[PDB]
Amino acid sequence: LDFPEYDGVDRVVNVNAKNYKNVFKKYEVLALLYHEPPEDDKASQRQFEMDELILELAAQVLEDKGVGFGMVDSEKDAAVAKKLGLTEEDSVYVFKGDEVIEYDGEFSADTLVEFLLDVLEDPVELIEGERELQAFENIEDDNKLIGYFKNKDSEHYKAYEDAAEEFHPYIPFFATFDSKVAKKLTLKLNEIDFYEAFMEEPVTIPDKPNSEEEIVSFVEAHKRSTLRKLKPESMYETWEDDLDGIHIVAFAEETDPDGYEFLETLKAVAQDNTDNPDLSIIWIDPDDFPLLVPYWEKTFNIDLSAPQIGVVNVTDADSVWMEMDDEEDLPSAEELEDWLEDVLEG
Amino acid sequence: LDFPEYDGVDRVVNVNAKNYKNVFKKYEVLALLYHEPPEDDKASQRQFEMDELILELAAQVLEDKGVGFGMVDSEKDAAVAKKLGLTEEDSVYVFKGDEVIEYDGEFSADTLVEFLLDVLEDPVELIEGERELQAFENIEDDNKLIGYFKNKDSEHYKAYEDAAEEFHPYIPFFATFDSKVAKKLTLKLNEIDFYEAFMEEPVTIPDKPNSEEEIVSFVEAHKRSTLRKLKPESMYETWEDDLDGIHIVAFAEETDPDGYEFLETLKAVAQDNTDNPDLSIIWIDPDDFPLLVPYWEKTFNIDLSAPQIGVVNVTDADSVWMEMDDEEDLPSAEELEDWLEDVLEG
Ligand SMILES: [Ca+2]
Ligand SMILES: [Ca+2]
Ligand SMILES: [Ca+2]
Ligand SMILES: [Ca+2]
Ligand SMILES: [Ca+2]
Ligand SMILES: [Ca+2]
Ligand SMILES: [Ca+2]
Ligand SMILES: [Ca+2]
Ligand SMILES: [Ca+2]
Ligand SMILES: [Ca+2]
Ligand SMILES: [Ca+2]
Ligand SMILES: [Ca+2]
Ligand SMILES: [Ca+2]
Ligand SMILES: [Ca+2]
Ligand SMILES: [Ca+2]
Ligand SMILES: [Ca+2]
Ligand SMILES: [Ca+2]
Ligand SMILES: [Ca+2]
Ligand SMILES: [Ca+2]
Ligand SMILES: [Ca+2]
Ligand SMILES: [Ca+2]
Ligand SMILES: [Ca+2]
Ligand SMILES: [Ca+2]
Ligand SMILES: [Ca+2]
Ligand SMILES: [Ca+2]
Ligand SMILES: [Ca+2]
């Protein structure tokens, strides 16, 4: 009645020109680890075996749900990788229907399975009644969309659902057919509002009713939020998406009163500067990455039991941190704005 | 710049009558896995080696923070185990100061390290100003206490801090010296309010000012909340604490609009029946245990993409689940009360 342990059945194989058509046929959803060939030393061999074991456990856990896992060698299987669109080494590409979803997060069985379980869900969630509306409003650490349509047979709803599939499961798409919900949201019929992460005010997609292409192009242009949360499921995607080799990194434990107070200041600063295309802040809650906390404290020379904020230069592997005597020496929004300005324009 | 990998240094040893005094001296905080001797078959041997490797990784991660890990064989080391108070096999006993903290949760390096990082924090958190007060009010999935005292030198504050140590890190103790915060909480000087998990209304500890013993005895009597959340850090403690071999188990994904709506009904039912000593509901959010979701769906024969609630008989290894056609066929509070009554008084 406990966590599953690998049962030794070989379910994850190398996916190559000989078998790839049969593997895609065997599984309704197929997730492919695109990897460089392991080096020949024993350490690199062991790590490769341990990585495969992670996939084996996930494949066992999800067998009855139509999910399969495979591995594609970027050298041996280069031709198949190209035909399938596998280009970023160490990414897992998830094939659902007509979509190819890139996973670029923690390589662990639990996080992988949680992601696949999100992939298997439908790309549009409905909102009806006050409690469901409250659930929608509680979402803030993701970009989200909500649109008001006549009903599920509306061509405009179907275009919205088709657009949701492009960003699944990263950007939740919500829909309502309830005119009372739409009024509380100030959504006119066939209007779509995009709520950037951590923002209070939405941006309405122009020129409604909107086609799939109009929604997709809009979401792609607003995909990067001023403030974004580092999450295990997407940690490497976020970290690799630096702006001119610079991240602003804020550490704050949401549940701690001092972390909450600092996070509220951070949100206020992001909201007041949300249209500055050069501002990108990563919020890391230490409680989400316990195994990295000592490493971050050593690397950055900071105490993560208190809120911290700094500028990390990925190009030069260097960083500077705002000097805060303790948890009670937090900057005002204005002081935080000014400190970022001083370090960046410099 | 990534998750740590075990470096092969042996930091976790068997703790026995010969070395236990030196181990306790080597480490400021020491966590001891109390385990039955591994069976001699190769499978049991491998599992024991894999368990030790989990401790090795945690010990590496926390080395610079004064934490050590050890293992105590319940047969070979029975005399030392008794002297140290190790009685429940498969529990990890954490020695901090004068306290012995039992860990009875997921045996994984990340969850273990997160718990130890919580252990290392101070047992009382202060509340000052409106934002910190809001952080206090946002806490609902734990029992919590808050007391109003003159200042940190008050003998009554010191008694409160001494009591907090007994329940650290499971039941957060908050304190304020701010008369404006105390007024919003309706806390008179030296009063202590206990907020049961998921309850709106607190219970004031009687006969203030309160001694350590009065607080400890009060908290012990109110320790078990009507509604409690299954969490990795304490999942086995919670599951083993059944009431006459019965758990009421509710599955609800907090972030999903249907899960939120059902959870609100569950909270309302718990609040209206909070004084019924026979009512104990475990809320499991599937998003917290992805690796167990397929196992639960198979074992209970339910769809965990929708909210579910049932009665699980641990004695007879049997369960019954409320029949809900889909996510929109949710019971009212009254219907849920009546359904529990019908299945239990039967
Ligand atoms: Ca294999
Ligand atoms: Ca497409
Ligand atoms: Ca990557
Ligand atoms: Ca986990
Ligand atoms: Ca509007
Ligand atoms: Ca249009
Ligand atoms: Ca990527
Ligand atoms: Ca704090
Ligand atoms: Ca504080
Ligand atoms: Ca913005
Ligand atoms: Ca955590
Ligand atoms: Ca923590
Ligand atoms: Ca403060
Ligand atoms: Ca060892
Ligand atoms: Ca004691
Ligand atoms: Ca136990
Ligand atoms: Ca983890
Ligand atoms: Ca009161
Ligand atoms: Ca008293
Ligand atoms: Ca226990
Ligand atoms: Ca739903
Ligand atoms: Ca619904
Ligand atoms: Ca109660
Ligand atoms: Ca989760
Ligand atoms: Ca989920
Ligand atoms: Ca509903």
Numbering used by the authors:
A (entry chain A), B (entry chain A): 4 to 349
Q: What sentences appear in the manuscript?
A:
Calsequestrin (Casq) is considered to be the major Ca2+-storage/buffer protein within the sarcoplasmic reticulum (SR) of both cardiac and skeletal muscle, where it resides as either its cardiac (Casq2) or skeletal (Casq1) isoform. Casq binds Ca2+ with a capacity roughly equivalent to a half of its total negative charge and an overall dissociation constant of ~1 mM. When studied in solution, Casq polymerizes as free Ca2+ concentrations increase and depolymerizes as Ca2+ concentrations decrease. We also showed that both glycosylation and phosphorylation alter the physical characteristics of Casq substantially, including its oligomerization and Ca2+-binding capacity.
Low-Ca2+ native bovine Casq1 crystallized in the P1 space group and contained four molecules in the unit cell; the resolution of its diffraction data was 2.74 Å, whereas low-Ca2+ recombinant bovine Casq1 crystallized in the C2221 space group and contained one molecule in the asymmetric unit, with a resolution of 1.88 Å. Both high-Ca2+ native and recombinant bovine Casq1 crystallized in the C2221 space group with three molecules in the asymmetric unit at resolutions of 2.60 and 2.14 Å, respectively. On the other hand, the three molecules in the high-Ca2+ asymmetric unit of native and recombinant corresponded to one-half of a linear hexamer. Residues 350 through 354 in the crystal structure of high-Ca2+ recombinant Casq1 could not be modeled because they were not resolvable, which indicates that residues 350 through 354 are inherently flexible. The larger structural variation among recombinant monomers, A, B and C, appeared to be due to a Leu246-mediated, Ca2+-dependent hydrophobic interaction that was only found in recombinant Casq1 upon exposure to a high Ca2+ concentration. Residues Glu244 through His250 normally form a loop stabilized by hydrogen bonds, a salt bridge (between Arg223 and Glu244) and hydrophobic interactions of Leu246 with nearby residues. In monomer B of the high-Ca2+ recombinant Casq1, however, this loop was deformed upon binding of one Ca2+ ion by the carboxylate sidechains of Asp245 and Asp247 and the backbone carbonyl group of Ile249. Consequently, the bound Ca2+ ion displaced the sidechain of Leu246 and swung it outward across the back-to-back interface and into a hydrophobic pocket formed by Ala20, Tyr23, Ala82 and Val83 of chain A. The Ca2+-dependent loop deformation also forced the backbone carbonyl of Gly248, which hydrogen bonds with the backbone amide of Val317 located in the middle of the N-linked glycosylation consensus sequence (316NVT318), downward against the glycosylation loop, which shifted the glycosylation loop accordingly. The net effect of the outward shift of α12 in monomer A and the Leu246-mediated, Ca2+-dependent hydrophobic interaction between monomers A and B was a break of the back-to-back symmetry.
